[PDB]
Design a protein around this ligand. Structure first.
Ligand code: IHP
Ligand code: CL
Lengths: 600, 597, 142, 396
């Protein structure tokens, strides 16, 4: 084609600096402006190429503030390559100049009014690509006529239909529902599947506000779909992609049908059912190719059919079949398929006909999460577990969430900790389970634990004698990992101040060992945390008189009594003073077991 | 599938044809375009034979270009760059120093099994070369090889080769041997390379002058590692080291400083010389604060340590640590620290006048720390206390919200260090009760009113107002309010029974904070119990606090002082840390990384 | 619907940009950057779907080129993922083992290919056979 | 010693790099990019440790130069070197810029393998280096105030006023976000003062675009200087899209139980310093049009359902940073309209915060008046930071 164009492009590439690039572009702009302005007329070859060079520069980022007039001339050329380029320019560089617009509309009019489908298509595309009101106003009335005329070529019908659709979306008021409706519907019977594909996109948009007017499309849409999904190898060769027949038209026909309720004609509803079952069956057949393109094309159709089934929410056998197929995707190479399967299953969980089916796949979801690498898939796995959780499920789901938590990334912890607390609250069977869960939650992921939540667990433990000794041992054995969470030291220190006595008799969890364990955390803690441990330590002087001397030792120390903080300095003094100046009977009065909380 | 992969046309094929053109200026341009490409992520692996053939050249610029390309593969894809080992062996023989050094550096930046075979002999040859640019490289490459696996006794032979290299004609060569060595020695075995080194010190301390800014830096660091035994051994090392400032402003100084500090304390404290060296060290440190900002920061972080170990050195030089309004926050803040550490009776006049400058500026973060700094000054120097408190009052009456609330938190710590001394002020503080929204400030007012209750006949209707919205208060504020209102009872048991029961009833019946609950009960079990015995536990005199909060355990400090140059002297932490634990909450942890302190 | 289509290289450089929605140039520029930051950060483990502003993006890379379709949230992911591949195959046939430079030197032609396969934010023609037949008839014209 | 030299553009894309030890992976780069280049609330320090790896950095124009190692390196050495490298570079191609780096990739590699062997700084002085370096650098190159203004008391006020906008998925992905801001200046200053202003490098000088517009009085050449109009005026206006501090995260747990009940739990997390209070907080959770009734329980603030609004509105007077709260609701539905499942509108928030969500921080404002008697130390100065919600939305 255009030698001057290739040269400019390769000159641009050889530039060694943005500075040089901008020099070569300004040079071209001067050249183009001269020639456009100059005395000598240009041959079309030149108009064509220079317009096309200006477009290149526009696409590189630079401003183009002339040229539009020259590209408008190209529209009236009888040479395709010249019109193409003219039409491309005005489609990518739209100006608001109302002389040009009027001029561009004439050019359109001639091309539409020629009978040349190549020229018709260029103009139709221009309209669809720009979509301006002035164009809608000039042509919106004409486009349906082109679309339903018995003589217009298929490609022109395809392009007319999508043009009409663009115009309907930008300028609805110019697209009334005239007499062309039934014949647009009739296009769903065209032999040319490209035409059928195009018409379907249009009717789907039109059916959104005009359902009654395109109600006839259902029956046609259903019989087309069923001929497509059962047709042989040697049928629809043009529209067969990696052994999957018309995947995109299939998808589109399934999508049109989501604008309507289940087919009112019992015959039609029946055909549609055979149809959907055929699709479900094919999912269970093995690949005809090991190329990922085949399974994706096949599964696009499968997923769109699953939406239809969900939207109709009216055939329980198909919904169950749907769950089970999605359940089989949950073990799959394709992260894509895992992703979509979980997403789609989340939907099915909230339907009555389908909730229980979904619960069936709990183990598979849990195994998938357990091994899953992609974060967005993990997230959707946890969302699913949440969605299906109930009285039966809850202990298993919670066990498994907690287990996963023990080795989980940081990416995902926060949301799981949150879900564990909430589910624990909704579904706790016995106060001991709740307690065993939260303390563990706190042990593993205490950094994300609401303060309120460790409050709760500390009150329950007070109000129930039966779990106190369990809570004490759990905390103690937890506290004795070399690394642990601060809220564990808050929860742990409080429980032990209050109930350390129930394990103090074990010689491996003695009063001394308890204390020194806490104290190996103390100076790595926040101030309110130490504030609590100063209270814990004073309960210990009382409960375990044997270790009063080491504790008084830490209270008299500089880091406590000359502490920069008010609470710490106030507690360490108050407490030393208590242990020193208080009668034993007094000390016991002050640090009795705290009374049970009120339940309200 | 394999779409867009074709190598029968497009950019790669165009470059392949240009790489075979027989005009070298067109080949040179190719290899540039290819390198440019790798950098932007293009696959250019297919061009590898074609690029490697461009090495068959007279032309230097061309050959060097092919090397750069091969170095790009060295790290990213090591198997790739192995394909051309046999060229490196030839090109380390080639009679151009420039090429010899080019083939060696590159051989040792590759990393697989099959590197050992080809590299050992040619390195053996390179440490033995008329050109000190070749031996400078070879040396560093001994490090490189060491990092590649295997103990290697022949490598142990290279370990000698390196030692022999420390004695050499050229300070560039010796410098890099040493730096290779100290790095080598650290990892992995212990006590390696130990020498009597009196020659070594001398060889290094003659080297350490004619040397380039880098050569010394390594030298010193290695040197500092040693432990002398005598006065006069230590001594003359120190005088030899002394000219270093400021060879290379930044690290040359601080590596000298490190050395001079370890050995310094081994000295008699005589004055004779000990005292001279200590006077020497003031100038060069102070000059660092005229460098670029990054390097200031490092120098300050270091000076901060040095000032705690030897406050003597910079006792006189507070002037340089004064804040310039356009320093980065991190250099501003570090300086502030040091001003407190050098603050002294002699200088408060000005310091205090400066801090007042800063506290009136538009950088909130920096303002807030400056009022703290004033308080830290009053706590530090008893004579300043009275003037500081005056300055703090001035500021409070300027009414700038965030200045008021910091100043008052400071004022409480001041009331605490100097009890029963600033009572008059308390009404001047209550004038501002409305304008406190931060939780710290509130608690400082509250605690203030709890102490000194009796000075205020109105201490009533104050602490009433703070009960109104007793929740929506910081649990810190609730705890302080609790203790302050039980302080008001033991002090004025009259109108108090109102409050005391209301506040004990909230902590005990309402609030879900179990720690607060516990504390409420505790007080309830003294007060609504026995009027007398509670006075001793609560109103008992609390001792005085001092600013040993900032100071580092002397044990640690010595360790950090030994690390003067390094990261450890920036983080203020033993290496084993950044190279038994409580994991703070995300609340705590995210919170901490904003406390400029 | 399809909001826009991009073909971009690793570097961030656009080689096709087709828009089916009104945007200012600043805006398009911004979007082209944003798409690049999202997609170049994902390895071969990730899905080919990702949410993007109040739409989402389906993308795949061929050699050094990312093909990206921005569509509505409720559009069928796998359908658009294979639409991309169908497009790429037509490109491969039309340019005889397509390379990135074919899209640079024939940029104006690439728009023809796109308009044949997509139009007004919808898939228009899916038949590789028909699209080529048409493209080659176009080429032979003057 | 030095384990990796990386040069990033203003996007935190690694333009060019050399890794000198096999410790330092893809991992190190991301660390730097995420925790420094896109630091959100952290206050930068020239040195940073993350995951037991140390990062040194200098900023030149729009470029980040970073140095990385896992060892107890000589800290001063690293920085000094970085200035010298910037010395060497700027003597081949001048300004250290994205453009100029891009044009000099080949040379830069060359410089790197010379200036730095195995992470050990080697002689790198310009005159010395000619011998080793084959390549050449590719180079490239009043009326708004009145006379005689007097005040007893010279004052200035700066207000940083920001509106923060967000669209977030239920999984917490930032779908889009921008801040719109402006600094309002209110100045009663004597005479004709020249002012020198300084801020952190946040602001760069329906799709949000990063922009900054200044008052006609403002000059540029780091910092900006002006002689201000008297009293109150808008110094600058700006919009930013990167590195925004989202003060609240909204975590929705909406659950459709059949076609008759709806279970809604929403948790909000405040994400700023603990010592700071957000105020006028509202959370607006929408309800379906066919809602028989609502039971709402919340234990912070108060909440009520409003049918004309089709929403649950939850109010909180104050919330500190790093806190968490929860509302929970049970919603009744009567499903006459059959099909056309509920398209959920997003959950929205209002709030006010005493900081700038863009991260803008004011570093200085120097007043210098040539004729008159006062100086900068005499000028009283208040700053205030008000940050407000704009369209702050989270899908559920
Ligand atoms: O008009 P000129 O300044 O002399 O420039 C010439 C030339 O015209 P000439 O034949 O007079 O040299 C070309 O050829 P024609 O079209 O006139 O036959 C033209 O077009 P092509 O190379 O595309 O055919 C080409 O390109 P452009 O104006 O886009 O740069 C441009 O050649 P130069 O690049 O050597 O100026
Ligand atoms: Cl199809």
């Amino acid at each position: 084609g255009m030698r001057g164009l290739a040269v400019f492009i390769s000159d641009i590439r050889n530039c060694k600096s943005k500075e040089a690039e901008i020099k070569r572009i300004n040079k071209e702009l001067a050249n183009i402006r001269s020639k456009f302005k100059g005395d000598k007329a240009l041959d079309g070859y030149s108009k064509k190429k220079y317009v096309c060079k200006l477009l290149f520069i526009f696409l590189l980022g630079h401003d183009i503030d002339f040229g539009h007039m020259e590209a408008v001339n190209l529209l009236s050329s009888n040479r395709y390559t010249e019109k193409q380029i003219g039409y491309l320019f005005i489609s990518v560089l739209v100006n608001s100049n109302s002389e040009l617009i009027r001029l561009i509309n004439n050019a359109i009019k001639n091309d539409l009014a020629s009978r040349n489908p190549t020229f018709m298509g260029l103009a139709l595309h221009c309209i669809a690509n720009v979509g301006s009101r002035e164009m809608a106003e000039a042509f919106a009335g004409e486009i349906p006529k082109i679309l339903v005329a018995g003589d217009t070529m298929d490609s022109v019908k395809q392009s007319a239909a999508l043009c009409l659709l663009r115009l309907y979306r930008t300028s609805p008021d110019l697209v009334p529902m005239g007499d062309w409706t039934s014949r647009v519907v009739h296009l769903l019977n065209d032999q040319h599947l490209g035409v059928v594909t195009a018409a379907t996109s249009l009717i789907t948009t039109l059916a959104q506000k005009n359902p009654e007017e395109f109600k006839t499309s259902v029956s046609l849409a259903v019989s087309r779909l069923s001929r497509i999904v059962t047709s042989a190898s040697t049928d629809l060769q043009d529209y067969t992609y990696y052994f999957v027949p018309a995947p995109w038209l299939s998808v589109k026909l399934l999508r049109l049908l989501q604008c309507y309720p289940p087919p009112e004609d019992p015959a039609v509803r029946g055909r549609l059912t055979e149809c959907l079952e055929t699709i479900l069956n094919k999912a269970q057949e093995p690949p005809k190719s090991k190329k990922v393109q085949h399974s994706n094309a096949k599964n696009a159709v499968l997923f769109e059919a699953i939406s239809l089934i969900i939207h109709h929410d009216s055939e329980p056998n198909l919904l169950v079949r749907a769950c089970n197929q999605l359940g089989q995707f949950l073990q799959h190479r394709e992260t894509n398929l895992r992703y979509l399967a979980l997403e789609s299953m989340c939907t099915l969980a909230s339907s009555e006909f389908s909730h229980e089916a979904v619960k069936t796949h709990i183990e598979t979801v849990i195994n998938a999460l357990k091994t899953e690498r992609d974060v967005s898939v993990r997230q959707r796995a946890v969302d699913l577990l949440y969605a299906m959780c109930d009285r039966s499920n809850a202990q298993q789901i919670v066990a498994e969430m907690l287990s996963y938590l023990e080795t989980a990334d940081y990416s995902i912890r926060e949301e799981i900790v949150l879900k564990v607390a909430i589910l624990a609250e909704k579904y706790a069977v016995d106060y001991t389970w709740y307690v065993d869960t939260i303390l563990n939650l706190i042990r593993i992921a205490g950094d994300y634990v609401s303060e309120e939540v460790w409050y709760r667990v500390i009150q329950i433990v007070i109000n129930r004698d039966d779990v106190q000794g369990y809570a004490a041992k759990t905390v103690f054995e937890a506290l004795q990992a070399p690394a642990c969470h601060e809220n564990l030291v808050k929860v742990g220190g409080y429980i032990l101040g209050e109930f350390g006595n129930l394990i103090a008799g074990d010689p491996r969890s003695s009063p001394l060992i308890q204390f020194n364990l806490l104290h190996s955390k103390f100076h790595l803690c926040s101030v309110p945390t130490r504030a609590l441990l100063l209270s814990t330590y004073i309960k210990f002087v009382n409960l375990f008189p044997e270790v009063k001397a080491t504790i008084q030792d830490v209270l008299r120390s500089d880091s406590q009594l000359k502490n920069a903080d008010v609470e710490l300095q106030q507690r360490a003094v108050e407490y030393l003073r208590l242990s020193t100046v208080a009668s034993t009977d007094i000390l016991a009065t002050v640090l009795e077991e705290m009374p049970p909380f009120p339940e309200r | 599938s394999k779409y867009f992969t074709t190598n029968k046309k497009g950019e790669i094929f165009e470059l392949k044809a240009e790489l075979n053109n027989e005009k070298k200026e067109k080949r040179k341009e190719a290899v540039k375009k290819v390198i440019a490409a790798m950098t932007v992520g293009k696959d250019v692996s297919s061009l590898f034979p074609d690029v490697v053939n461009c090495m068959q050249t007279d032309n230097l610029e061309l050959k060097k270009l092919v090397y750069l390309y091969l170095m790009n593969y060295a790290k990213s894809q090591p198997d790739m760059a192995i394909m051309a080992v046999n060229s490196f062996v030839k090109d380390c023989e080639d009679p151009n120093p420039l090429i010899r050094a080019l083939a060696v550096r590159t051989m040792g930046c590759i990393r697989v099994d099959k590197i050992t075979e080809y590299l050992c002999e040619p390195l053996r040859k390179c440490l033995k070369d008329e050109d000190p640019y070749v031996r400078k490289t070879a040396a560093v490459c001994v490090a490189k090889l060491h990092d590649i696996n295997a103990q290697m006794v022949e490598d142990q032979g290279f370990l000698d080769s390196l030692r022999d290299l420390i004695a050499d004609s050229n300070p560039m060569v010796v410098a890099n041997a040493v730096a290779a060595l100290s790095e080598i020695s650290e990892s992995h075995p212990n006590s390696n390379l130990l020498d009597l080194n009196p020659q070594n010190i001398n060889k290094l301390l003659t080297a350490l002058n004619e040397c380039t800014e880098w050569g010394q830096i390594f030298i010193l660091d290695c040197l500092s590692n040693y432990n002398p035994k005598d006065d006069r051994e230590a001594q003359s090392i120190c005088e030899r080291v002394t000219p270093r400032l400021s060879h290379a402003n930044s690290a040359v100084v601080l590596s000298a400083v490190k050395v001079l500090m370890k050995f310094l304390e081994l000295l008699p404290k005589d004055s004779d010389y000990y005292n001279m060296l200590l006077k020497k060290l003031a100038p060069p440190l102070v000059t660092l604060l005229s460098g670029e900002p990054e390097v200031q920061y490092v120098a300050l972080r270091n000076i901060n340590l040095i000032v705690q170990k030897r406050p003597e050195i910079l006792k006189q030089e507070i002037k340089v640590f004064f804040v310039k309004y356009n320093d980065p926050i991190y250099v501003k803040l570090e300086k502030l620290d040091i001003m407190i550490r050098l603050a002294s009776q002699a200088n408060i006049a000005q310091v205090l006048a400066e801090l007042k400058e800063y506290a009136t500026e538009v950088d909130v973060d920096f303002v807030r720390k400056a009022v703290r700094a004033i308080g830290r000054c009053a706590i530090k120097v008893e004579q300043s206390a009275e003037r500081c408190v005056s300055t703090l009052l001035d500021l409070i009456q300027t009414k700038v919200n965030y200045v008021v609330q910091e100043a008052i938190v400071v004022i409480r710590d001041i009331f605490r260090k100097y009890p029963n001394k600033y009572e008059s002020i308390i009404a001047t503080l209550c004038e501002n009760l409305d304008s406190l929204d931060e939780p710290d400030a509130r608690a400082a007012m509250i605690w203030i009113v709890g102490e000194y209750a009796e000075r205020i006949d109105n201490a009533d209707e104050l602490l009433e107002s703070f009960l109104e919205g007793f929740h929506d208060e910081s649990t810190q504020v609730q705890l302080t309010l609790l203790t302050a209102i039980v302080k008001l009872f033991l002090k004025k048991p009259s109108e108090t029974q109102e409050l005391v029961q209301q506040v004990l009833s909230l902590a005990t019946q309402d609030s879900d904070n179990p720690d607060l609950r516990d504390r409420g009960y505790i007080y309830w079990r003294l007060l609504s119990t026995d009027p007398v015995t509670a006075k001793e536990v609560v109103l008992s005199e609390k001792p005085l606090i001092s600013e040993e909060t900032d100071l580092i355990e002397p044990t640690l400090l010595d360790e950090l002082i030994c690390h003067i140059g390094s990261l450890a002297s920036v983080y203020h932490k033993p290496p084993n840390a950044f190279v038994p634990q409580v994991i703070p909450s995300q609340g705590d942890l995210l919170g901490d990384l904003l406390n400029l302190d | 619907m399809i909001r826009f289509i991009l073909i971009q290289n690793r570097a961030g450089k656009t080689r096709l940009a087709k828009w089916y929605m009104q945007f200012d140039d600043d805006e398009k520029q911004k979007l082209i950057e944003e798409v690049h930051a999202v997609v170049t950060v994902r390895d071969a483990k990730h899905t080919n779907f990702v949410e993007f502003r109040n739409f989402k993006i389906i993308y795949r890379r061929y050699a050094g080129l990312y093909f990206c379709i921005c569509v509505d949230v409720n559009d069928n992911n796998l359908a658009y993922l294979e639409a991309i591949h169908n497009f790429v195959e037509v490109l491969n046939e039309y340019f005889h083992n397509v390379c990135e430079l074919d899209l640079v030197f024939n940029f104006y032609k690439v728009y023809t290919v796109v308009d044949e396969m997509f139009l007004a934010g919808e898939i228009r023609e899916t038949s590789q056979t028909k699209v080529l037949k048409q493209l080659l008839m176009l080429q032979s014209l003057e | 010693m030095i384990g990796g030299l990386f040069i990033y553009n203003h996007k935190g894309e690694v333009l060019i790099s050399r890794v000198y030890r096999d410790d330092i992976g893809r991992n190190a780069v991301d660390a730097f990019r995420v925790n420094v280049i896109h630091a959100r609330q952290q206050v930068r320090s020239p040195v940073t440790n993350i995951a037991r790896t140390s990062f040194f950095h200098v900023k030149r124009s729009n470029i980040w130069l970073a140095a990385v190692t896992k060892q107890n390196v000589n800290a001063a050495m690293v920085f000094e070197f970085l200035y010298k490298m910037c010395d060497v570079m700027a003597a081949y191609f001048g300004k250290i810029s994205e453009e100029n780096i891009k044009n000099n990739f080949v040379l830069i590699y060359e410089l790197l393998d010379e200036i730095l062997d195995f992470g050990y700084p080697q002689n790198s002085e310009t005159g010395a280096l000619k011998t080793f370096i084959t390549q050449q650098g590719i180079k490239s190159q009043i009326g708004w105030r009145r006379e005689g203004i007097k005040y007893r008391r010279n004052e200035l006020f700066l207000d940083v006023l920001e509106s923060v906008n967000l669209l977030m998925s239920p999984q917490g992905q930032v779908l889009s976000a921008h801040v719109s801001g402006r600094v309002v200046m209110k100045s009663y200053l004597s005479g004709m003062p020249e002012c020198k202003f300084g801020m952190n490098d946040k602001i760069v000088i329906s799709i949000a675009i990063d922009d900054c517009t200044f008052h006609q009085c403002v000059r540029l050449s780091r910092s900006i200087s002006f002689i201000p109009p008297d009293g109150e005026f808008e110094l600058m206006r700006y919009r930013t899209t990167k590195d925004i501090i989202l003060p609240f995260r909204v975590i929705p747990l909406v659950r459709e139980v059949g076609r008759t009940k709806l279970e809604v739990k929403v948790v909000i997390k405040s994400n700023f310093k603990p010592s700071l209070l957000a105020q006028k907080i509202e959370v607006r959770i929408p309800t379906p049009l066919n809602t028989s009734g609502v039971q709402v329980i919340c234990m912070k603030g108060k909440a009520k359902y409003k049918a004309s609004e089709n929403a649950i509105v939850w109010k909180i007077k104050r919330m500190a940073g790093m806190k968490e709260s929860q509302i929970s609701a049970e919603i009744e539905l009567l499903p006459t309209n059959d099909k056309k499942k509920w398209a959920r509108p997003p959950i929205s928030m209002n709030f006010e915060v005493p900081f700038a969500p863009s991260g803008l921080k004011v570093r200085y404002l120097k007043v210098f008046e040539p004729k008159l008697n006062y100086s900068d130390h005499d000028v009283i100065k208040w700053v205030r930071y008000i940050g407000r919600s704009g369209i702050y939305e989270t899908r559920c």
